[PDB]
Write a protein that binds this ligand. Structure first.
Ligand SMILES: Cc1cc2nc3c(=O)[nH]c(=O)nc-3n(C[C@H](O)[C@H](O)[C@H](O)COP(=O)(O)OP(=O)(O)OC[C@H]3O[C@@H](n4cnc5c(N)ncnc54)[C@H](O)[C@@H]3O)c2cc1C
Ligand SMILES: Cc1cc2nc3c(=O)[nH]c(=O)nc-3n(C[C@H](O)[C@H](O)[C@H](O)COP(=O)(O)OP(=O)(O)OC[C@H]3O[C@@H](n4cnc5c(N)ncnc54)[C@H](O)[C@@H]3O)c2cc1C
Ligand SMILES: O=c1ccn([C@@H]2O[C@H](COP(=O)(O)OP(=O)(O)O)[C@@H](O)[C@H]2O)c(=O)[nH]1
Ligand SMILES: O=c1ccn([C@@H]2O[C@H](COP(=O)(O)OP(=O)(O)O)[C@@H](O)[C@H]2O)c(=O)[nH]1
Lengths: 393, 394
């Protein structure tokens, strides 16, 4: 079919940022090809039929950023609530303040530690390694929170989530979490955050709203690309699906994690009194439980029912959609081969690669969007509007 | 010009300055604000601690919050607000507790996680020890509401320190100030809008007094200057926000108030307690709370190696003390009744209105004081100033 100026594979925040930018800022005709039956990638939301409560289909999505560029951009498509994310950690039958801060320290060690007292305590317990010298997840984690807290709140959660030796996981995984010596327990440390007032799916649909954008759901790129590109040969492609799958796993399989969920409607108005409860112990199969009513107190939610979602992690087999890049040293070697294939495909077939799946990177929503805005301004727009090379100067 | 005052306002706290600003800017009236202290703002006055430069509140820590959008929109004319949300922690038997009482405190104190339903059931059954109807005092009523363990831990001795009044003889609404939750929400206030003034309270207050039609007299006692000022401006009403009993020479007796003492101290550490306010719920320390002011403004560049803290002590307001909180004994409410009659008669004969915390013997938060002043303005003072309407009501 035609006519299109640009193809985008995948309708997550990366793909839709590209589509919206090309359509509105250049007046380009965009075709977005989505294999799932819905838009939005893993950020897709939908109502639970019984309660009418909006659920994040793939587990809680919390938006946060310190990038004002991004904040201004996304506010063109949605309003945000004043929500600030806080997570509690269940360990040995007790709910703990989390992440690292004077709350967690005083609870776990059984009495109040002042900022200076806590700094001294953790410094002793972390002394087996300095943070600068840390070379993997386990080392970095211990260097920041100390061995006792590492063993209680990090080690077993990480084992459930990754089922991978912590000495072979990336150090940057732990630096996602704030590390504090105050009573501050905000899960993020960014300037801006909140939840979309009308929900994620509305926000995503608003990004795809321009008349120059066409979205085709339930369509696999690899089934339709040859005839699509033949009819529109000038159009480049932005691919946001799994990187290894694009090349038919020719350089080996990257390790990914996937998730399963159990959604349950309960006959109580409030199951756990907080949106997300982490379960840090090996004795329960799920990593955390989401209770979505707490994300939108402003809505007309029932007061005698609630929807919760248990989250279970496992390896992405060949049958599964991947959710998390694992990035072991072995993975990173396979990734290097795929990055080489990707750059070749960009030069030859005018296919760009982006997003969590397209680049095998642990990307939050705001980082995917920043990345797409950059790709559009610096690489794609000059190609589309002056015929500049996708192999940039 | 100067003088030819249309309105006298006694006191330059948030109530008085709201009145003065509204009369000036909305009605074009000339206002004289008479203030006995050497600065405006009443107890909300802020200033920098000299050694650290950190902005402190010498008359007590002040946290702004409101659920009234009209009040919010009004105060934002004079200041911007940070995104600060107040949280308080409670020190008991050497441990820091999440506070106010919610799933955090419940889980910490009772030693395991309680779900919303489990916590509701727990509190209900412990509270069942005493029937609220049969409660003979503060202690029994507190127990009948939250149960004996929570009462004996976080309310009993803290209440004893701050009021030194029989808990059975204190207003029930006092505890209503704290939100009560079966969630993990520990945001101290329940109000829609809050934050700290970006340039501090004193700048906010100065902006309220900025209109050229407002003249302010500092270091001036209304009772020293009123006769000749009113003789020169006989038509001008008076909005009095000083002490109600002092106004009438304590003729009906003296109203009971609590006062606070403060000890400001600069410490050679960048962070003393990692949070703005720590309550001390136990009898083994004499102060009720410690404030650490750097945490009121994280957005500012404060010293990395010093901090200013302020210990708070509560006692009876003796004759030379500043009154902070009304005690409201039955003898007090009776004394108040007599003064309320005096006040109404004075409104009728002398065109004096009584307002604010001191003027009405009523504790008032800032947002309450501002709302009260806006209401007085709309219903009583502005129609009087604009149309000659009567100041007499109810
Ligand atoms: C469990 C989970 C929790 C998360 N929580 C947060 C959070 O709290 N805060 C935050 O900021 N971010 C969070 N994220 C990240 C977020 O979901 C996205 O990864 C982020 O928005 C990046 O989007 P993306 O477009 O790069 O990838 P995706 O959202 O995965 O979109 C890629 C799209 O490509 C589609 N696709 C794949 N192959 C094909 C094909 N052959 N043909 C057509 N379409 C194809 C896919 O169906 C998918 O829709 C979470 C992610 C996951 C998995
Ligand atoms: C320790 C303390 C802590 C507080 N903490 C908070 C808080 O966290 N959040 C919040 O919202 N509110 C708080 N408040 C309330 C806050 O101070 C309000 O702004 C205040 O109640 C406003 O009411 P007001 O203007 O009538 O009182 P005031 O602020 O007391 O002003 C009355 C003024 O009248 C002056 N005056 C009295 N007699 C005379 C006289 N004869 N002649 C001339 N002038 C006179 C006084 O000097 C004073 O300046 C606190 C109050 C106190 C005392
Ligand atoms: O209670 C927790 C939370 C996080 N993590 C570790 O920190 C990483 C990042 O945590 P995040 O909360 O960012 O994970 P996501 O929500 O992206 O799955 C996890 O993969 C774990 O390895 C942990 O060990 N315990
Ligand atoms: O840890 C606390 C905090 C408050 N209160 C009671 O609740 C009242 C209201 O507390 P607030 O924090 O509102 O007091 P303020 O800041 O006005 O002095 C206090 O007077 C006490 O009687 C208590 O018993 N324990």
């Amino acid at each position: 079919t035609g006519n299109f100026d640009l193809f985008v594979v995948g309708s997550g925040f990366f793909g839709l940022t590209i589509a919206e930018r090309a359509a509105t800022q250049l007046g380009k005709r965009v075709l977005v090809i989505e294999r799932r039956p819905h838009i939005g990638g893993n950020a897709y939301s939908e109502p639970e039929p019984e309660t009418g409560i909006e659920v994040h289909k793939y587990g809680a999505h919390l938006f946060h950023t310190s990038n004002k560029r991004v904040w201004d951009y996304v506010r063109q498509f949605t309003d945000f609530t004043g929500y600030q994310h806080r997570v509690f950690a269940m360990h040995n039958g007790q709910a703990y303040q989390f992440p690292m801060g004077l709350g967690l320290v005083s609870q776990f060690f059984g009495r109040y530690f002042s900022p200076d007292e806590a700094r001294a305590l953790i410094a002793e317990q972390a002394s087996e390694i300095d943070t600068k010298d840390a070379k993997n997840f386990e080392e970095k984690a211990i260097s920041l929170v100390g061995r006792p807290l590492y063993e209680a709140f990090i080690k077993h959660y990480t084992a459930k989530q990754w089922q991978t030796d912590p000495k072979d996981l990336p150090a940057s995984n732990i630096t996602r979490l704030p590390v504090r010596y105050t009573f501050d327990n905000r899960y993020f440390n960014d300037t801006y955050e909140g939840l979309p007032v009308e929900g994620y799916t509305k926000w995503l649909e608003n990004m795809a709203a321009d008349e120059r954008i066409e979205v085709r759901l339930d369509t696999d790129w690899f089934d339709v690309r040859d005839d699509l590109r033949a009819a529109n040969p000038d159009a480049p492609v932005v691919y946001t699906g799994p990187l290894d799958r694009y090349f038919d796993y020719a350089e080996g399989r990257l390790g990914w994690r996937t998730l399963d969920f159990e959604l349950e409607v309960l006959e109580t108005g409030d199951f756990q009194g907080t949106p997300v409860m982490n379960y840090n112990d090996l004795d329960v199969p799920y990593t955390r439980i989401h209770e979505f009513r707490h994300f939108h107190p402003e809505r007309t939610y029932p007061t005698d029912k609630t929807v919760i979602m248990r989250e279970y992690s496992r390896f992405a087999d060949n049958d599964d959609e991947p959710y998390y890049p694992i990035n072991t040293e072995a993975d990173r070697a396979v990734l290097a081969a795929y990055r080489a294939r990707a750059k070749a495909e960009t030069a030859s077939a005018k296919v760009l690669f982006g997003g969590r799946l397209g680049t095998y990177q642990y990307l939050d929503m705001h980082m995917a969007i920043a990345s797409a805005l950059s790709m559009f301004d610096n690489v794609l727009a000059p190609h589309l509007s002056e015929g500049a090379s996708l192999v940039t100067e």
